[PDB]
Design a protein around this nucleic acid. Structure first.
Ligand SMILES: [Mg+2]
Ligand SMILES: [Mg+2]
Length: 820
RNA sequence: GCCCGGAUGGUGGAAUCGGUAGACACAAGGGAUCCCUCGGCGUUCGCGCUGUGCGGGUUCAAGUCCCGCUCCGGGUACC
């Protein structure tokens, strides 16, 4: 062995072994239990950030641990490669988006390798390649024929392609119930986003108006509180009035260049229950796109109605009682909560549910109302007027009929050799590209490209069979691996990507491509990486943000930054730990850290400093501790193997000291296993390993037996540490002369017999307060425990002239003397 | 507003089952890369008092469980 740990001498050698042996490449093997461990695929922006490194370290820890458990593990990697940032960059550089992207892919890929992430590289995908995106093109045309795709003019205002996600709203909603291993926060977020609403539509007569007006409400129980109606600016009635109302016309237009504003239509509606005439306004807070584009305003009870009403001097009216039985104070604001009705005629004293239903029945029966479900979820807009994305496989024939691009004209290849006049898509500015021909007779092909959410909605499934032509998926491959066992990414994608891929999975199931309802069993959302942030105020009053690496802090009595400076000698203020930014200038580059300390150090810190799902505060000094630890592990292994082979261990003959140490070894194995496998508290896992290593370094290494126990302990630690720091462990495994490559060594299992105790610790309380800890035989009787607790001066002096009233005893744990 | 966390040393945090609080690490500081000290106050060095945001409550026993309070963090809404 070499005396120095030198990651530079070890990491690339091990990495190259992994490529040469294709260690992490896997097939669909039915004799083994599968495990699919998936991290969210990176966008090739140019270089990895600390988010990626934390995300992929977590995945890799799991993937490696699961392999050592004897499972067949898929850990795939890929590139979500279309998108906007390349178009602006092709521009700011000489280049085109494709070559820029491929350059970025190559560079980041080399970074992922230097971190020793054990991916199956034979499954690598880059989504901007025809070999990938042809398949979403083919699937689009299929979805079209299914009745799930349509074209529509709509606001953002332009013609767009939509996929009908609303057709699966109730499945997307109900199936949240099957996802116990998704975090609540994410689930709630998809509920809210779907926004399933049970309500009542209520139609009014209007006075000098030859139609009726319908509103949608979720609170029909408050109907008697309705003092006016609000209609969206795009409402037919508001546009009607606006012909003879110059001021209204102004408003139907000020609602584009975008807190309450409105204009009176002049129209009076007739409330159906009261006969009372009420005013219709156009209001800026009424969505034309949801419900009916109009509301019954109840300002006593909805906050937006309240603010609109008191700003335009409209009647506010209380109709729901206070929580406590009393009439409510509406002087400040709307009273929001459901409660008992008053001020509502025949409906007085009814509570929310009984009232909802009484007032709906009555209105249904007068023929001016009906129950109604609405959804906040709108259909998914998939077209972009952008160049860098998959072309949309649709065609307009010269006669005017739209249809899918024919199967023999697929894939519709987007061309990569282009010049950017960076403001028109090269496939738009040249009028030849659009030109094509179907069945003879000329045709114009679509020029919009896919929303980039389109590639990231199905990649996880394509990883199962990435080289399969003949189909989007190989169903036997896909069904072997799916569903994903753990999916690891940020919580920010909750109602975008996390929703699209569930929807797409069900799309693929319904085309007979997969046989399961949901794509992923567990979602783990890893916290943010934060760094320290500093700034000085310049002569001009402007805040200049200084990188904490450039910061020079000065502690105090006890640690505590009391004053800091940069090299220019500016006075810095410390704002704490915060999200990493360009604004705040506090980004840490993982490449610098990987090259400073080695990857194992960087990984070990990332996994140690904080639980997967809590924020992680980057510290250089914590990183350096992780580095020093690896050196202490290296040293111990070196001093040990320097002495050569060991005799076989003899378990029956060990000292009480030797037995205690061996028991710490196997208890650690048990705790580390539980913490990684079941709890997923990787930081406490690592802490147990360190705790154990501190004890090992202090143990004797001279006798045949001491040395054999060390051999065992080291072989166990090196495996336990391997999912976090594979390069150093792979190496030390060899040095210790373990069987084969560490990547296929079995996860250590704790030996039940080694964990048995001969003695135990019993805490003695006197009236509930500790006064001693005693070591008694493991099987001492209660009487023996009381007698020995008594012999302890530390106890016996809280038993002087005072008498034991009763005693509480938990076998082998606690004796509580109640006194006295 | 709403949902969701959290509060324990100088800092980051542990404590799963109510029963040895503060593991592990950093920051120290100090001593000839490591062994050590390290919650606060006092010490005769064995401990003693005190202590997990503030009020209660249950319990022989609360960081842990229940009821208020006060604070902090991060998401999010004219649906
Ligand atoms: Mg934890
Ligand atoms: Mg406990």
């Amino acid at each position: 062995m070499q005396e120095q740990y030198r990651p530079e001498e070890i990491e690339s050698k091990v990495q190259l072994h992994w490529d040469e042996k294709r260690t992490f490449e896997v097939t669909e093997d039915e004799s083994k239990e599968k495990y699919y461990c998936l991290s969210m695929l990176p966008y090739p922006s140019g270089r990895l950030h600390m988010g990626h490194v934390r995300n992929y370290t977590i995945g890799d820890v799991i993937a490696r641990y699961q392999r050592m458990l004897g499972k067949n593990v898929l850990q795939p990697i890929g590139w979500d490669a279309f998108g906007l940032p390349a178009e602006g960059a092709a521009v700011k550089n000489n280049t085109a988006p494709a070559p820029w992207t491929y350059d970025n892919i190559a560079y980041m890929k080399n970074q992922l390798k230097m971190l020793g992430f054990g991916y199956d590289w034979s499954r690598e995908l880059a989504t901007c390649t025809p070999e990938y995106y042809r398949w979403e093109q083919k699937f689009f045309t299929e979805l079209y024929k299914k009745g799930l795709v349509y074209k529509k003019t709509s606001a953002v205002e332009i013609p767009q392609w939509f996929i009908k996600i609303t057709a699966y709203a109730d499945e997307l909603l109900n199936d949240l119930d099957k996802l116990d291993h998704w975090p609540d926060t994410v689930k709630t977020m998809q509920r809210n986003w779907i926004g399933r609403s049970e309500g009542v539509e209520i139609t009014f007569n209007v006075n000098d108006y030859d139609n009726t007006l319908t509103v949608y409400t979720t609170r029909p129980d408050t109907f008697m509180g309705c003092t006016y109606l609000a209609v969206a600016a795009g409402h037919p009635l508001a546009q009607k009035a606006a012909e003879n109302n110059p001021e209204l016309a102004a408003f139907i237009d000020e609602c584009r260049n975008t807190e309450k504003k409105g204009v009176d239509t002049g129209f009076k509606a007739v409330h159906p229950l009261t006969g009372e005439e009420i005013p219709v306004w156009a209001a800026n807070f009424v969505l034309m796109e949801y419900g009916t584009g109009a509301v019954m305003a109840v300002p006593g009870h909805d906050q937006r109605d309240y603010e609109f009403a008191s700003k335009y001097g409209l009647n506010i009216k209380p109709v729901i009682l206070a929580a406590d039985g009393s009439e409510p104070d509406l002087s400040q604001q709307a009273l929001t909560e459901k409660g008992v009705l008053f001020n509502s005629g025949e409906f007085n004293g009814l509570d929310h549910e009984a009232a909802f239903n009484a007032i709906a029945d009555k209105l249904t029966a007068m023929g001016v109302g009906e129950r109604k479900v609405n959804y906040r979820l709108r259909d998914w807009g998939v077209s972009r007027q952008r160049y860098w994305g998959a072309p949309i496989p649709m065609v307009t024939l010269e006669d005017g009929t739209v249809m899918p691009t024919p199967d023999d004209q697929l894939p519709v290849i987007l061309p990569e050799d282009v010049v950017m006049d960076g403001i028109t898509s090269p496939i738009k500015a040249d009028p030849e590209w659009a030109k094509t021909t179907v069945n003879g007779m000329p045709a114009l092909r679509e020029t919009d490209t896919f929303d980039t959410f389109m590639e990231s909605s199905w990649y996880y499934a394509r990883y199962t069979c990435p080289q399969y032509k003949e189909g989007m998926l190989d169903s036997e491959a896909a069904n072997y691996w799916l569903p994903v066992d753990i999916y690891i990414g940020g919580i920010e994608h909750a109602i975008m990507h996390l929703l699209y891929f569930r929807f797409f999975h069900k799309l693929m199931r319904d085309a007979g491509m997969v046989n399961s309802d949901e794509p992923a069993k567990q979602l783990l959302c890893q916290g943010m990486v934060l760094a320290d942030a500093f700034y000085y105020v310049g002569e001009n009053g402007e805040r200049n943000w200084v990188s904490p690496v450039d910061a020079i802090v000065e502690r105090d009595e006890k640690g505590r930054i009391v004053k800091a400076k940069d090299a220019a000698g500016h006075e810095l203020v410390y704002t704490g730990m915060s999200k990493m930014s360009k604004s705040k200038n506090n980004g840490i580059d993982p490449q610098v850290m990987v090259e400073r300390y080695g990857a194992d150090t960087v990984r070990l810190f990332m996994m140690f400093a904080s639980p997967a799902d809590m924020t992680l505060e980057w510290q250089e000094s914590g990183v350096e501790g992780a580095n020093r630890f690896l050196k202490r592990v290296w040293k111990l292994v070196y001093e040990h193997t320097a002495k050569g082979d060991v005799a076989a261990l003899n378990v029956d003959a060990l000292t009480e000291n030797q037995k205690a140490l061996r028991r710490d070894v196997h208890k650690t194995i048990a705790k580390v296993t539980d913490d990684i496998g079941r709890r997923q508290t990787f930081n406490t896992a690592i802490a147990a390993i360190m705790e154990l290593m501190n004890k090992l370094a202090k143990a004797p290494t001279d006798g045949e037996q001491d040395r054999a126990l060390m051999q065992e302990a080291l072989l166990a630690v090196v495996r336990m540490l391997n999912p976090f720091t594979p390069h150093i462990c792979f190496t030390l495994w060899q040095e210790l002369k373990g069987e084969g490559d560490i990547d296929n060594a079995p996860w250590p299992v704790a030996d039940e017999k080694a964990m048995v105790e001969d003695s135990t610790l019993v805490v003695v309380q006197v009236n509930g307060k500790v006064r001693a800890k005693i070591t008694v035989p493991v099987d001492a009787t209660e009487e023996q425990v009381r007698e020995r607790a008594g012999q302890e001066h530390l106890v016996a002096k809280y038993l002087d002239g005072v008498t034991v009233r009763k005693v509480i005893y938990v076998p082998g744990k606690l004796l509580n003397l109640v006194v006295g």
